[PDB]
């Protein structure tokens, strides 16, 4: 009902934070030449359509992606608002939206749903990723409170604490995107509740530069490409 606890703390935000603390794990890592996003997906359903095109990971425009921990129903309302804002910026300025302007845009909407008592807050945590000329490769996180922070590597959702410790000891400022592929897969295999990692339990993506000077490219990996980085990395659930 958006009233303070006597400590000056918001009960609804704390309960929304309890909800996302169950909501599946996501890791993001910022290499010297690209960003990696990975998310672990609890497929307890055989008849759920794996090889559906998205669940945890989404495009916001041609150079920005997100991972979702939380309610996917809540996330998709924010994701569409961010997509509309990215194209409305591109229409106005003829230029691609800077990552800080969009990440904090979704952090200002999520704060409003925490102040007015007719609205429940959004049960979603986002690990944003992208490139722009103002900064370069940027990795941000945002949570049900409307707080947002810049990171070199971060986890959200379940098992955050184990994942942050594993990131901290292996992360290097000068590492390449293929080292961040390896690291994010290792971290998730060293954090997972499921017995071993496999291509349908895993959502993956990258924000590389490629060979051509003007390019930045956002491969949100199809299952067969994820099977290749799995067998190359030594996670290798292979015949």
């Amino acid at each position: 009902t958006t009233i303070f606890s006597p400590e000056g703390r918001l009960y609804q935000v704390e309960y929304a934070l309890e909800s996302i603390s169950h909501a599946g794990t996501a890791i993001g890592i910022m290499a010297s030449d690209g960003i990696v996003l990975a998310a672990e997906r609890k497929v307890t359903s055989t008849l759920l359509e794996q090889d559906t095109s998205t669940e945890k990971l989404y495009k916001l425009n041609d150079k920005i992606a997100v991972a979702v921990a939380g309610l996917t129903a809540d996330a998709e309302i924010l994701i569409n608002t961010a997509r509309i804002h990215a194209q409305n910026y591109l229409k106005t300025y003829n230029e691609d939206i800077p990552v800080e302007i969009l990440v904090r845009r979704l952090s200002d909407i999520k704060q409003g749903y925490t102040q007015h008592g007719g609205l429940r807050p959004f049960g979603v945590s986002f690990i944003y990723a992208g490139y722009d000329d103002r900064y370069g490769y940027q990795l941000y996180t945002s949570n049900p409170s409307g707080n947002y922070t810049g990171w070199k590597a971060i986890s959200v959702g379940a098992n955050t604490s184990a994942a942050q410790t594993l990131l901290q000891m292996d992360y290097k400022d000068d590492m390449k995107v293929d080292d961040a592929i390896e690291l994010a897969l290792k971290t998730l295999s060293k954090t997972t509740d499921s017995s071993a990692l496999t291509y349908d339990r895993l959502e993956f993506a990258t924000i590389r530069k490629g060979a051509n000077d003007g390019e930045v490219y956002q491969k949100i990996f199809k299952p067969q490409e994820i099977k290749d980085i799995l067998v190359k990395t030594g996670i290798t659930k292979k015949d």
Binding site: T81, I109, G112, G118
Partner: protein, 90 residues
């Protein structure tokens, strides 16, 4: 003026057609019928606020008899704090 003949008519069409309907129901059925219909619409409009959705409401289309009809206004449609401090008064 230089302004299109049809502009002021189509701007106010939705309001005008309901205002004209309520006056017919007052005349044919008495003051109780538009008093009932305006209070149903008040409960539906006033208890249905969500800063990110502007695409009408499902029960308002049932109340207004618009549940199986499209206008050009439904295919061609046209800040959360500014919405909050309008809904509550500033």
């Amino acid at each position: 003026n230089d302004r299109h003949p049809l502009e002021s008519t189509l701007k106010n069409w939705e309001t005008t057609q309901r205002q004209r309907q309520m006056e017919q129901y007052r005349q044919i059925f008495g003051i109780a019928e538009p008093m009932k219909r305006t209070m149903e619409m008040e409960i539906v409009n006033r208890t249905d606020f969500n800063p990110l959705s502007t695409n009408g409401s499902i029960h308002r289309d049932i109340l207004l008899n618009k549940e199986c009809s499209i206008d050009w206004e439904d295919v061609y449609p046209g800040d959360v704090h500014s919405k909050i401090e309008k809904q509550l008064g500033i």
